Structures are given as structure tokens and as C-alpha cells.
Amino acid sequence: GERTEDYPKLLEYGLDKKVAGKLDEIYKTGKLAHAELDERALDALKEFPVDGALNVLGQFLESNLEHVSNKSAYLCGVMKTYRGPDEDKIKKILERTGYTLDVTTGQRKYGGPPPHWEGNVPGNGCEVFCGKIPKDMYEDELIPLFENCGIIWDLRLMMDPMTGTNRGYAFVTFTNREAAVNAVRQLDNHEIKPGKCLKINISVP
Amino acid sequence: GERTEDYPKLLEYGLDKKVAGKLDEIYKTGKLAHAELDERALDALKEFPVDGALNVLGQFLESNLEHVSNKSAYLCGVMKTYRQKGPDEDKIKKILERTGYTLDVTTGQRKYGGPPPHWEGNVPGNGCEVFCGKIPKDMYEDELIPLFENCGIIWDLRLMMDPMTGTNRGYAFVTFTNREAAVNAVRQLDNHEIKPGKCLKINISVP
């Protein structure tokens, strides 16, 4: 295909030809729209060393952007840093619970709130910390694990915007305190992977 | 031992002394309070022959009254049945604790959730419900709930009961929070051998 209508706009703005061509490729993919890239974001991109900019746009184009409700703010997140899971397991999980999945540069959030949730959030009394998570793991394996403890209100897997893997920990909020305590009691020191034991702590002792 | 302060109140109401005696004995056990039974239930009891009234009270005494919110309606249910056992409570306690769901027991039904805690908006409805048949008559929701929990999120579960026997009628309805879960339950659990030689019959409520 030919260049998009916004290609010469990028060039006029003073972007390096190579950087402008890469961003335009992103435009034609549909990952991003030119109408949602502010002059601030373009300036930041312009301030990048050329091969730096190419890598950032390269990482953006070659990343799983499914369930990313804000592609623009995501790219900006990638830029600040430089400055996925089994899709069919995920699909089946989201279908059967109806829960939202939202991915940002530093987090993959499952639910929070669940569909049709009434009243206040459970809070931190119903929340547990889950540390020492194997970096290769995602919520497709974490969610079924914690579902046995009770009803997940949310699950937030913290992500490394650079490495692409998780930061090795997550928070899980259940709909009540007893489920949280249940998770601590039964899943602390759980060998989720050969040689890899999780660390589960109640957020509010 | 001595009789409760509600014993003479029963006698004043015109209850046969023998019937009032047995009812007051039920009061003592804590399974029932005089405040719980309303006049409609007592009148129905008074119309009963003494031999009949005594056995209605006997069946009530022997009933699993755990999680029965409406004792009056339960007593009336036994009476209407006459003119014609339970879950592992440690399992139930754990389930109810981790989910926070209500459990309500009537003479003809054991109901889990419906609605769940903190449910806002539209009920899932019949489109998200499955029929579960050929349930072994000795099975209760302590075993049925963990089975259907793997399929999706249970909005409610209604195990139908035989007021005559106190065992189930061999079928239940399960409503999930969406239809994908319901369809999932049908696909994965139809003909599920829940006990050796006993396979469940799961049908979507709305084909």
C-alpha cells in the first residue's frame, strides 16, 4: 500500500524520514491514529535519537496491543522507558466471566470492577500480594489459580515496560476478606512452576 | 425439664394440650421460636387431628432446618405435604464464607445466591440458565456448586427438593452471569459421571 495522508504531515513537522515512515506504517496497521497523536508526543518522538525512535516504534508495532484501550498513552509509556498470554485461554476466560481486561505499559488489569458490581470496592482488606511470579507467566494461568480461593474482584499483574515480561508480582482483590485469607493460607509457597514458589501476603494484616 | 413461657400462650390459643406440648418441646431445642410462628400457621395446625398434628410436628422436628429463613412457611409446607439428610455443613460453611452468597432452604427448594452479593442491574435471566437433571437423590449443593463453578460465575443455583422425603427431586437449575458460561456448562458437563455409574443430564434452558 501507499503512504497515508498523514505521512507528509509528519515530514512537514520535521520528523526524520525513517521515523516518519515507521510511524506511518503504524498508522496503516490501525494500531494508532494520527488524530490521537498530539504535538507533545511528536516532539518527544522528534527528540529521540533516530535509531532510538526506530526501536520504540518497532517495539510498539511488534507488541500485543490486544485489550489496550489507550494505544496513544501506551506508546508514550514505551518512550519514557527507553528514555503475551495464550490468546485462546484468555478468550475463554473473558467469555465465561464477562470480565474486562485492560493492558497498560506497567499493568495488565483483570476486572476491577467485575460486571454488575454494586456499591463500594472491597478495598485492601480483601486484597493479597502475590510475589515471586515467574516472569514468563501471565493472567491466563494466574486467574484460574486464584478463582479456587473465592471470587476475584480484580487481578493486577504488574508489567515491565522494557523487558515485556511481568515485574514478578501482582495484587488480587477478592469480593470478601475470607477469600483473601483463604488464598494466603492455601497458596503461599505454592510451586506454580518447577522450583518456583509463590509468595502470598495479605495486604492488610 | 420445665415448660417455656410460650406454653400457656399455645394453650390459650386453643391448641390441643398434647400438640401444644410437642410444639413447646420444639421451642426448647431452639429450632423454632414462638415469635417465628405466626397465627396463620397455628390455625392450620389447629385444624389438624391430634394424631396428624403430632406427626407434622414430628416431621418438622426431624427436618434439616439449617439455612431456613422462614420457619412458618416451612411448617406450613410440611402440613400441606402431610395431607397427601443434608450437605456436609463444613463444606457449606467454607463455600458460603469464600463467596459470601446466601443459602436459603424451603421444603421444595435449596437456593444458592440469586442474587449474589453486590449484584447491580439486570438479572441474567433464562437465557443464562441450564437445567441439570438425573442428580443422585442424596446429593446436595455442597457438591453441585464446585462442579458448576468451573464453567463460569454462578448467579444462582436451585436444587429442587421432595418435601415428602427431604431428598432432592433429581434436578436443579443453574443460572450463570452470561450465556457463554451456560453454553459452556452444557457442552462440558452433559453426561458428566458425577458419581460412579451416574451421569448428569444438562440442557440449556433456552435453546
Author numbering:
A (entry chain B): 22 to 104, 122 to 243
B (entry chain A): 22 to 105, 121 to 243
Structure paper excerpt:
Syncrip is a conserved RNA-binding protein important in neuronal and muscular development in Drosophila and mammals.
In order to investigate the non-canonical N-terminal RNA-binding region of Syncrip and to provide a structural framework for our studies, we set out to determine the structure of the N-terminal region of the conserved N-terminal ‘acidic’ and RRM1 domains (NeR1 construct) in Human and Drosophila Syncrip proteins. The Drosophila protein crystallised in space group P21 with two copies in the asymmetric unit. The 2.2 Å resolution X-ray structure was solved by single-wavelength anomalous diffraction (SAD) using a seleno-methionine derivatised protein. The presence of multiple high-confidence RNA-bound peptides in this region indicates it likely plays a role in the interaction with target RNAs in the cell. This indicates that the N-terminal ‘acidic’ domain, although specific to Syncrip protein, contains patterns of short sequences often associated with RNA-binding sites in other proteins. We also show that the domain is functionally and physically coupled by a structural element to a second RNA-binding region comprising the RRM domains, and that the coordinated interaction of multiple Syncrip RNA-binding domains is the basis of efficient recognition of the full-length miRNA.
